[PDB]
Write a protein that binds this ligand. Structure first.
Ligand SMILES: Nc1ncnc2c1ncn2[C@@H]1O[C@H](COP(=O)(O)OP(=O)(O)OP(O)(O)=S)[C@@H](O)[C@H]1O
Ligand SMILES: Nc1ncnc2c1ncn2[C@@H]1O[C@H](COP(=O)(O)OP(=O)(O)OP(O)(O)=S)[C@@H](O)[C@H]1O
Ligand SMILES: [Mg+2]
Ligand SMILES: [Mg+2]
Ligand SMILES: [Zn+2]
Ligand SMILES: [Zn+2]
Lengths: 598, 598
DNA sequence: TTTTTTTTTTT
């Protein structure tokens, strides 16, 4: 069972070819992976245990049925095919092997006891983690008479005491020395099934995963992962004293591999080292697409290809996916400086607001979707819970902190009583949060960006009242936003006809990987710095805004807006990779700021 | 004695005939034993009415003991299986046997089962609560002596058990007088298991008494049948718990049947007959059902035409990742005493999954979902509301104008996106609530009056008024002769307790509840050639309600009514494409809903 | 059988 499998696995690792494409035939697929493992660190080999289903079917039966008696063989059989690069680079730890599956295999509700101790894949949304927990591997005993120190190994899963000193023979004198032994790490994590893939009218479950030595801190609460690992069940004892164990066991999952890369969402900020892993064939494409005179309107108009025209809102929601520069103000003692853009959408019903939130939330990774009445003051930022076991108050993170890199869509913005609405004042302007409760006195921080949607008061935009009266929001909250989009319902018959003609079409029946990579690039290698010709159009663009917004009674302008223009201007320059802010990048993001409130 | 019973059961298992198989006299258990011998089946629901057909004595002594007999049967089948086709005779069982209640017994209530029926076959009815999740329960623990290379087993009965440290094989002990043996979760055998509580129907309780509970240990194959908050009927032994003389008791389920419909679950027998396809194929099948909905109520020929579309429901799309709901919501604004709380009470009983709620007796967190703490553990858990428990069905809210205004905006979420997004201080999730709502309300101050226009003797904010595809508006103006027919109807009802016999007869409730479930799964399409007709209709609407002095707030959410109110009709006529004759029916409905004002 | 924090029904 042991020798018969490494011989059958090495073959796979050597002679395998796929009808696929990687990193944007180079036959030695896993040998190329094994070469990359040698040119850099990171001694892990991510093998797909479905490729081993094409090449073979009698190991793919024994990998998902006896995974703990196979994966050591899959390590050994990789160490030897590392012969090519043995003399070149000599790392130390060992080489590893990690089977996985591109697609899930089960739910959290259909785990049956014919699946105990066999490879299994699920998916969920990590809720909370814990601090490290040691776990002994090699004991270290020592006698009180002979003072002789033997070092017994844990082989089966328990530690046995020798009871005979190899020198003095006192038949029990070998104490266990703790801090001279060897330990390894162990973390406890909790999943939670996704809203999709659950039965009719039911509440989410949780499942406990146990990480191990190297996967110990590779995931954060608020992430959506595809965990792959063995499924085990261990007994429990009714007393912590007697050996009367129960008969209903208790199950967890010894994780073996994570996967956070989903196809449909953009690139999360773990792949900044992976941006240097772009095909140089692709950087040409991006730099050349960034030269056409309207690449702005050509990318924007490719957001949500189901909304009707609404041309400006897609412009704003596209500039929000880039954000101003990340300047470093630690020297001036000013503090930090927000670089993300907050957008508010107000307008009478039926105008397709909630569809834009539902579309963005499904686009960006690391996001959330909240509502009006089903969210409280502390549930959005940070609460304090009586931890069940240790009976102590511990801090947790809300929704505005779990996003932290992404967008926090807050629908039904009007229908939140003024208490829970005055909480956003801190987290959305300073990018911080200062907590001072019973035993916890700390200061979090996040890099979120709200995208809110509200209805006018009376839910009907009556043009008798003033713009600062249909919204009915204060000024200390309207100024923290910088793009207040007033959608309206004009009764032009031509518009209604075109819209209906468009909507009916949804009943019969640019690319993404251009946008999905253009964005990663424009994040990685761009930093627009202002100029002196641009800076001289930014001063007057604020001295006129005051005289304009003063009289009309629409929405006043405070110096904070003058920073928003910066935030917008720079964010425009990033679209075209211009690396330097010029004049037009202020006129555009000034016309945008003016022609949204009309 | 029992040695002669193990033969009187083998006789019955090998000899029993049955005619209703639709063929000749075959063997009900003759085929079953073969299937079980080929490991294509796990459970064998030995009915007891069939033993009570040729031996009404054995039934008397089964329901008297039912604990020995459920073992004699599992020995009889254990012997018969090889004759058709390890050491302990239980590790190689791989099937289980369950008694299906005898018809002569009567279903007790939870309060009735007393101590005089401990250890007998009983039958209870109740509401499920706190169903656990499946966990592996051990049956035959398999140990191994690694030293002497052997295998040993032990069978478990209690909810606890003490392991072994012997290796009682006299050879291993005799040779060396030393050796320990490890437990092992491979050679052992688990079985699914979950516990769930039952409560009395709060209806069948003394006027002000507290309901009593019982515990049910579902295991084997009956798992995952029952959902929490559910009407169920259970059949199983009633035993005491192991480990002074007082004893706590649980019900050990042998058979679980859902009785939601007030009779049974007949999803297996739910197929229609050609003699019913006769009716369903008639010209006006759509018009028979409409008249056979709450026949006790005179008039309202059109309202019953829409309350059927609500039960059938349109189709739901998903283009370019932009969900569109496929349910219909309906309100019944109207004067007092027009039988609205009768129509709703009827549509409650004609739905597989339904819920009934009153506006003045239900809070906004009790509709959607509530987070509540456990003073035993201090842990906050989620608890579904009304709209969650009515996931794939219908919810009914009468007295809808009297619901508190902060407890009513908690429905705007469930009516469009059909999720519930909770971000309180224990939980952060989105439950699925795909319910279609039906509500009733009184217009202004009890009675419509012709002085004030609409929208002021209705008092709904446009944002909520537009969520309803059909806000039906009923009036009652006195009529010297219509009152006469209404009275001659109601007095007939109070004489005979039935409705007067019209030309034809209403279908039974049991039969319509099947006619509809067959009529849901069609999914018709839309033809392109119609997009010009539909369009014009919609345009015309935006004219009238823009050039009138009474009309409501119409928006681009009205077009999707016309669209989704026609895929319902085309779904009744069993077509697989929407035809120009149904668009006009839909358009007539959306017009016959406000004519009661002219 | 005590504090402190957080949610929901009630006067
Ligand atoms: N311009 C548009 N493009 C595409 N779909 C639209 C457009 N306008 C309206 N719709 C459709 O009309 C409906 C509008 O619903 P929503 O997007 O939820 O509106 P809303 O802004 O959420 O309404 P309220 O204010 O919250 S009740 C959806 O079915 C949209 O598909
Ligand atoms: N057309 C009708 N056909 C049959 N019964 C009717 C009719 N009109 C009234 N009734 C009876 O009159 C009573 C009306 O009571 P409800 O159905 O509660 O009225 P309602 O529509 O709920 O009025 P509100 O909204 O609660 S004041 C019931 O006993 C009905 O059976
Ligand atoms: Mg909305
Ligand atoms: Mg009523
Ligand atoms: Zn010693
Ligand atoms: Zn032994």
């Amino acid at each position: 069972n042991v020798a018969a499998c490494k011989e059958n696995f090495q073959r796979f690792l050597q002679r395998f070819i796929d009808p696929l494409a990687k990193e944007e035939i180079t036959e030695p697929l896993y040998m190329q992976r094994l070469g990359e493992i040698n040119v850099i660190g990171e001694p892990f080999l991510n093998v797909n245990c479905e490729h081993i289903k094409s090449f073979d079917k009698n190991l793919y039966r024994q990998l998902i049925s006896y995974p703990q008696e196979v994966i050591p063989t899959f390590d050994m059989a990789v160490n030897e095919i590392f012969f090519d690069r043995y003399p070149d680079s000599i790392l130390e730890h060992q080489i590893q092997v990690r089977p996985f599956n591109a697609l899930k295999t089960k739910n959290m509700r259909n785990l049956n006891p014919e699946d105990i101790d066999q490879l299994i894949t699920i998916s969920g949304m990590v809720i909370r983690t814990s601090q490290l927990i040691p776990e002994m591997q090699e004991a270290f005993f020592q006698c009180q008479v002979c003072a002789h120190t033997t070092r017994v190994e844990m082989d089966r899963g328990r530690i046995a005491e020798p009871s005979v000193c190899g020198r003095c023979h006192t038949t029990h004198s070998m104490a266990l020395i703790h801090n001279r032994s060897l330990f390894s790490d162990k973390q406890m994590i909790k999943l939670q099934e996704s809203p999709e893939d659950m039965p009719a009218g039911q509440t989410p479950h949780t499942v406990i995963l146990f990480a191990h030595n190297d996967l110990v801190d590779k995931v954060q609460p608020g992430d959506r992962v595809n965990v792959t690992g063995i499924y085990r069940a261990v007994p429990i004892r009714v007393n912590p004293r007697v050996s009367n164990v129960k008969s209903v066991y208790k199950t967890h999952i010894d994780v073996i591999h994570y996967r956070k890369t989903d196809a449909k969402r953009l690139h999360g900020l773990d792949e900044e080292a992976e941006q240097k892993l772009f095909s140089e064939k692709r950087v040409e494409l991006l730099k050349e697409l960034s030269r056409k005179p309207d690449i702005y309107e050509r990318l924007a108009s490719a957001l949500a290809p189901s909304i009707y025209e609404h041309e400006d809102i897609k412009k704003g929601i596209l500039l929000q996916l880039f954000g101003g520069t990340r300047k470093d103000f630690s020297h001036t003692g000013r503090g930090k400086f927000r670089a993300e853009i907050n957008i508010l959408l107000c307008g009478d019903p039926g105008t397709s607001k909630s569809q834009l939130l539902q579309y963005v939330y499904n686009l960006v990774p690391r996001g959330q979707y909240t509502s009006g009445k089903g969210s409280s003051a502390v549930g959005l930022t940070a609460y304090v819970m009586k931890d069940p076991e240790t009976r102590q108050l511990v801090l947790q993170t809300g929704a505005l902190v779990l996003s932290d890199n992404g967008i926090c869509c807050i629908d039904e913005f009007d229908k939140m009583n003024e208490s829970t609405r005055s909480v956003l004042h801190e987290v959305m302007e300073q990018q911080t949060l200062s907590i001072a409760k019973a035993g916890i006195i700390c200061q979090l921080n996040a890099r979120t960006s709200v995208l809110a949607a509200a209805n006018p008061i009376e839910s009907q935009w009556n043009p008798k009242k003033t713009t600062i009266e249909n919204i009915q929001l204060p000024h200390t909250l309207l100024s923290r936003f910088d793009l207040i989009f007033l959608l309206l319902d004009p009764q032009d018959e031509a518009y209604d006809r075109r819209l209906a003609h468009h909507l009916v079409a949804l009943y019969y029946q640019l690319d993404m990987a251009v946008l999905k990579d253009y964005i990663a690039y424009a994040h990685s290698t761009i930093m627009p710095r202002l100029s002196e010709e641009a800076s001289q159009a930014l001063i007057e663009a604020y001295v006129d805004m005051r005289k304009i917004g003063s009289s009309r009674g629409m929405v006043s302008a405070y110096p904070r807006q003058l920073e928003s223009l910066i935030r917008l201007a720079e964010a425009h320059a990033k679209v075209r990779l211009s690396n330097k802010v010029e004049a037009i990048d202020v006129e555009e993001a000034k016309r945008l700021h003016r022609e949204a409130l009309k | 004695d029992y040695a002669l019973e193990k033969e009187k059961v083998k006789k019955f298992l090998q000899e029993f005939y049955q005619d209703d198989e639709l063929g000749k006299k075959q063997f009900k258990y003759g085929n079953q034993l073969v299937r079980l011998a080929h490991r294509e089946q796990v459970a064998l629901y030995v009915d007891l009415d069939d033993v009570a057909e040729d031996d009404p004595e054995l039934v008397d002594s089964i329901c008297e003991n039912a604990r020995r007999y459920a073992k004699l049967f599992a020995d009889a089948v254990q012997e018969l299986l090889p004759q058709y086709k390890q050491y302990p005779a239980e590790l190689m069982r791989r099937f289980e046997l369950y008694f299906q209640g005898p018809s002569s017994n009567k279903p007790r209530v939870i309060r009735e089962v007393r101590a005089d029926s401990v250890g007998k076959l009983v039958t209870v009815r109740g509401i499920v609560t706190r169903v656990s999740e499946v966990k592996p329960k051990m049956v035959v623990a398999t140990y191994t002596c690694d030293q002497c290379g052997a295998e040993t087993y032990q069978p478990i009965q209690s909810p606890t058990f003490m392991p072994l440290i012997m290796c009682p094989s006299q050879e291993c002990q005799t040779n060396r007088s030393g050796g320990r043996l490890y437990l092992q979760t491979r050679g052992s055998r688990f079985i699914k298991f979950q516990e769930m509580k039952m409560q009395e129907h709060s209806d069948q309780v003394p006027v002000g008494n507290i309901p009593r509970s019982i515990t049910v240990l579902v295991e084997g194959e009956n798992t995952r049948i029952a959902q929490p908050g559910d009407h169920v009927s259970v059949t199983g032994i009633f035993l005491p718990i192991l480990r002074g003389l007082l004893s706590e008791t649980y019900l050990e389920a042998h058979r679980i049947v859902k009785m939601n419909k007030s009779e049974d679950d007949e999803s297996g027998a739910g197929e229609l007959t050609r003699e019913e396809l006769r009716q369903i194929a008639e010209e006006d099948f759509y018009e028979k059902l409409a008249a056979s909905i709450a026949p006790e109520i005179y008039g309202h020929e059109d309202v019953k035409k829409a309350l059927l579309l609500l039960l059938v429901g349109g189709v739901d799309q998903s283009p370019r990742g932009m969900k569109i709901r496929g349910n219909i919501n309906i309100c019944l604004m109207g004067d007092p005493g027009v039988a609205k709380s009768q129509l709703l009470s009827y549509i409650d009983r004609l739905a597989p999954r339904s819920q009934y709620t009153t506006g003045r007796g239900s809070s906004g967190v009790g509709l959607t979902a509530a987070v509540l703490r456990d003073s035993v553990s201090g842990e906050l858990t989620l608890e579904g509301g009304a709209l969650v428990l009515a996931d794939q069905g219908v919810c009914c809210i009468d007295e809808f104008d009297k619901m508190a205004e902060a407890d009513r905006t908690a429905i705007h979420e469930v009516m469009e996106q059909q999720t519930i997004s909770i971000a309180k201080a224990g939980i952060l999730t989105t439950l699925n609530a795909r319910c279609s709502i039906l509500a009733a309300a009184n217009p202004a101050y009890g009675r419509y009056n012709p002085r004030r226009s609409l929208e002021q003797n209705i008092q709904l904010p446009a944002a909520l008024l537009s969520r309803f595809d059909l806000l039906w508006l009923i009036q009652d103006r006195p009529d010297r002769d219509n009152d006469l027919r209404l009275a001659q109807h109601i007095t007939y009802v109070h004489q005979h307790s039935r409705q007067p016999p019209s030309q034809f007869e209403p279908l039974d409730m049991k039969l319509m509840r099947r006619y509809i479930a067959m009529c849901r799964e069609k999914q018709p399409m839309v033809p392109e050639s119609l997009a010009d007709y539909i369009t014009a209709a919609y345009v015309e609407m935006r004219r009238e309600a823009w050039a009138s002095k009474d009309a409501t707030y119409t928006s681009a959410r009205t077009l999707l009514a016309i669209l989704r109110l026609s895929t319902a009709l085309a779904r009744l006529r069993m077509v697989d494409v929407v035809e120009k004759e149904d668009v006009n029916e839909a358009i007539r409905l959306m017009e016959m809903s406000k004519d009661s004002l002219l």
